[PDB]
Amino acid sequence: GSAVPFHGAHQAGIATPVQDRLHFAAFDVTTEDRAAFVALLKEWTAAARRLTAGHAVGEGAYGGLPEAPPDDTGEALGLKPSRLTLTIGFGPSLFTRFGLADLRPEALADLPKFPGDNLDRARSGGDLCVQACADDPQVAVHAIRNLARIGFGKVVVRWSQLGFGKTSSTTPDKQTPRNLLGFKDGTRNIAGTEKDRLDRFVWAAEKDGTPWMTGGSYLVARRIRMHIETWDRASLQEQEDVFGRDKGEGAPVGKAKERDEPFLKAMKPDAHVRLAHPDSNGGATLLRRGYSFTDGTDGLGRLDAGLFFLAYQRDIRTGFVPVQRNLATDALNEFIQHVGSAVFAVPPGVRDADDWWGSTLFGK
Amino acid sequence: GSAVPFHGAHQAGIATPVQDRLHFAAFDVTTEDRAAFVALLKEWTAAARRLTAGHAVGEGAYGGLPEAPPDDTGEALGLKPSRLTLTIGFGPSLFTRFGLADLRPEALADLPKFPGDNLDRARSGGDLCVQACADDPQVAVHAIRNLARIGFGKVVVRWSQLGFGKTSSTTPDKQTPRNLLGFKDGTRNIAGTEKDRLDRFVWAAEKDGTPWMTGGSYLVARRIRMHIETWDRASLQEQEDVFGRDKGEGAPVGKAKERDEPFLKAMKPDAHVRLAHPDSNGGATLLRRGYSFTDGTDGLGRLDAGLFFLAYQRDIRTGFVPVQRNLATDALNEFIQHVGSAVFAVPPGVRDADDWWGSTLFGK
Ligand code: HEM
Numbered sequence: 001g002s003a004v005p006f007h008g009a010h011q012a013g014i015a016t017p018v019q020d021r022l023h024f025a026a027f028d029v030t031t032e033d034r035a036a037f038v039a040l041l042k043e044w045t046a047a048a049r050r051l052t053a054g055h056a057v058g059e060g061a062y063g064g065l066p067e068a069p070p071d072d073t074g075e076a077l078g079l080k081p082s083r084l085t086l087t088i089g090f091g092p093s094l095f096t097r098f099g100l101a102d103l104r105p106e107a108l109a110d111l112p113k114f115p116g117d118n119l120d121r122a123r124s125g126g127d128l129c130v131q132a133c134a135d136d137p138q139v140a141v142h143a144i145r146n147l148a149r150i151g152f153g154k155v156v157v158r159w160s161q162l163g164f165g166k167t168s169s170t171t172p173d174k175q176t177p178r179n180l181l182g183f184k185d186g187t188r189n190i191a192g193t194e195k196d197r198l199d200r201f202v203w204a205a206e207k208d209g210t211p212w213m214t215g216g217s218y219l220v221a222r223r224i225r226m227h228i229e230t231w232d233r234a235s236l237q238e239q240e241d242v243f244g245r246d247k248g249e250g251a252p253v254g255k256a257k258e259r260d261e262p263f264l265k266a267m268k269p270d271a272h273v274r275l276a277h278p279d280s281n282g283g284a285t286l287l288r289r290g291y292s293f294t295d296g297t298d299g300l301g302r303l304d305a306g307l308f309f310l311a312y313q314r315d316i317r318t319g320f321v322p323v324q325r326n327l328a329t330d331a332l333n334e335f336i337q338h339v340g341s342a343v344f345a346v347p348p349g350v351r352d353a354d355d356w357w358g359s360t361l362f363g364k
Numbered sequence: 365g366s367a368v369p370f371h372g373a374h375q376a377g378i379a380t381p382v383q384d385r386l387h388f389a390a391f392d393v394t395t396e397d398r399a400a401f402v403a404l405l406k407e408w409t410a411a412a413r414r415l416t417a418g419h420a421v422g423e424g425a426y427g428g429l430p431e432a433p434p435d436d437t438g439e440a441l442g443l444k445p446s447r448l449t450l451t452i453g454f455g456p457s458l459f460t461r462f463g464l465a466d467l468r469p470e471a472l473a474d475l476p477k478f479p480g481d482n483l484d485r486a487r488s489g490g491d492l493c494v495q496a497c498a499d500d501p502q503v504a505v506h507a508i509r510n511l512a513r514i515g516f517g518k519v520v521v522r523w524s525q526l527g528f529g530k531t532s533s534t535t536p537d538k539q540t541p542r543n544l545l546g547f548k549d550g551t552r553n554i555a556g557t558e559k560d561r562l563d564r565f566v567w568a569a570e571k572d573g574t575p576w577m578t579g580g581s582y583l584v585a586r587r588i589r590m591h592i593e594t595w596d597r598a599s600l601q602e603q604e605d606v607f608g609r610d611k612g613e614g615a616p617v618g619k620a621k622e623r624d625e626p627f628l629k630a631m632k633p634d635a636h637v638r639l640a641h642p643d644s645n646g647g648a649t650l651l652r653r654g655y656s657f658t659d660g661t662d663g664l665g666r667l668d669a670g671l672f673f674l675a676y677q678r679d680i681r682t683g684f685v686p687v688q689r690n691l692a693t694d695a696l697n698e699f700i701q702h703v704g705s706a707v708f709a710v711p712p713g714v715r716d717a718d719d720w721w722g723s724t725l726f727g728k
Pocket residue numbers: 179181183184185186187188189222224226243245262272273276277278286306307309320323324327336
């Protein structure tokens with residue numbers, strides 16, 4: 001139940017080990033007062049400093065004046081930090097307001113339309129996001145709820161997504177989690193300890209063209225429905241052909257061990273690993289950090305489930321976009337559909353107790 | 365503890381220790397063939413024996429013939445039994461099939477409509493339920509998903525609810541959970557250790573009038589949304605007045621400790637605890653075994669969260685019905701809304717390796 005340090009050159013929640021639970025909220029800005037929004041950012045940063053340490057926001061959850069609403073809603077009382085990370089991101093639409101147009105990063109690229117998508121606009125986009133990840137779902141919900149409350153009147157929650165379990169790994173020394181198709185997901189990602197790969201593929205640099213984003217990353221979110229009924233009808237061989245790995249061990253086709261490096265030529269030309277591999281994409285590499293979800297039933301007798309895909313990269317134009325383009329022929333496309341999407345510029349870290357979310361963007 | 369025995373005089377998941385996570389699914393029957401439904405119950409029981417021991421169903425999740433779909437969908441490979449319990453129940457609607465009408469228990473009473481109810485029929489009812497409780501949500505989800513797959517052609521999933529309580533890896537097992545209103549929830553309840561209280565209040569007895577139910581119990585499910593944002597605007601005194609207990613410690617008004625017995629007369633007349641207490645209900649007492657839920661954000665931007673209330677009782681007419689009726693004037697009603705409901709007759713246990721779910725109802 002240990003805490004994850006909140007301050008750093010980078011925001012936590014990216015290279016951090018992937019926690020068990022996600023609560024992801026996209027917000028829209030409702031205030032037109034730049035000074036009021038800066039004020040909110042600072043109040044949110046202060047709150048996050050408490051939440052990630054396992055403390056109550058403001059003056060606490062009780063012990064105040066009886067006639068006043070408690071500052072903290074209280075449902076995390078008695079709980080540990082639970083590795084909570086809170087990661088803030090700025091969507092392209094934010095840059096139409098507060099006079100931020102010229103500061104919109106070119107690497108914050110709007111996505112093209114991809115064949116087969118059916119994106120729900122209401123659960124796509126967003127002026128900003130907060131990614132709350134923790135090992136305790138009550139800690140994660142509490143953090144989002146209290147941030148939303150602090151922001152009432154200045155921001156609204158556009159859409160949110162809970163992930164009940166991870167489908168990603170930044171720790172190759174630990175067990176790779178399985179997604180709801182039954183396959184390990186996260187074997188060949190980027191590790192928190194891979195500083196050179198993180199610099200090459202995840203962290204933006206000043207010379208990239210957007211100084212305020214130095215030490216930040218760019219986030220692509222994609223809500224992916226899984227055609228479970230169809231998948232569960234597929235043969236074992238078909239399922240393994242789709243990915244290029246065997247199901248039980250998760251090794252590349254022909255190999256004995258999960259982490260043995262793939263020999264792509266041995267997979268089907270439309271195998272997912274073969275098309276997504278960096279070597280098939282001129283070196284493009286992603287830090288995937290997604291989570292499984294379930295959304296009740298489809299109203300038609302079947303569990304409704306999927307994967308909330310999250311990818312961090314130094315530049316969307318050289319990460320998610322080329323890779324997802326190469327997935328146009330992916331054998332996996334028969335079993336999935338992309339149904340929500342959003343991109344965000346995730347700023348650099350909160351340097352210290354005097355700093356605040358967005359300070360490099362908004363100045364001061 | 366890592367596992368809970370599947371076999372017994374009673375079904376597990378009622379009096380056994382409360383696990384961290386829930387996947388509750390209601391099923392509807394899609395076959396008229398009684399023998400085919402009995403065959404399913406036998407295959408389901410066989411699967412449950414595997415799942416509650418952390419093993420894959422059938423011949424496994426891999427290694428079979430390449431041209432066959434795997435018997436198990438694989439998403440729990442590498443996980444642990446996680447204290448998984450699988451508890452089956454039969455809804456009133458089941459008894460209109462297979463000639464069972466004259467075997468519906470009188471104690472399986474339909475619930476009256478209660479003041480303020482706003483029940484989504486799509487998330488209510490069901491011919492059957494399976495309550496899957498585990499410490500790891502993916503174990504619970506895997507269990508539901510695979511039972512649903514095994515049963516496909518004979519049953520469908522009507523509705524499905526994920527829930528969470530504490531996270532036991534970081535939260536002391538004796539610490540009362542808090543609900544999403546920030547209050548301790550479960551202080552005065554029946555515990556599975558109180559054998560005499562279970563016999564009095566929870567288990568059906570032969571003399572009660574339905575022999576096949578002897579050693580079973582009756583379950584009431586209620587999906588109860590909370591008006592989170594209005595609640596969080598209420599003063600600390602208003603919130604405590606609603607329950608009759610203070611928020612921080614959870615002690616009854618006028619008392620110092622959580623577990624001190626309440627002086628109901630010092631609570632406001634409409635306080636939840638005063639209205640729900642057995643002394644206010646002719647001694648009616650419930651085994652509450654619910655879970656908090658958070659499903660996301662609704663269309664208005666508000667948090668879709670609440671309590672998935674579950675209560676077990678020897679007779680719905682003498683348990684949940686009187687107590688819920690007594691909540692007509694509950695001050696808590698301002699802040700909650702019941703939005704889904706179902707009742708189930710939970711049969712006695714699977715006695716040994718030759719027994720099967722429902723054998724006392726269907727006959728052997
Ligand atoms: C529901 C959708 C998806 C599922 C079930 C899925 C599943 C998998 C699995 C099982 C693997 C092999 C193990 C691993 O190395 O992680 C994999 C690899 C990978 N996937 Fe996906 N994936 C999905 C969507 C995506 C998308 C949208 C992208 C990017 C646009 C993507 C990019 C990658 C990459 C880059 C790899 C590693 C390839 C390598 O370098 O070997 N995946 N995925």
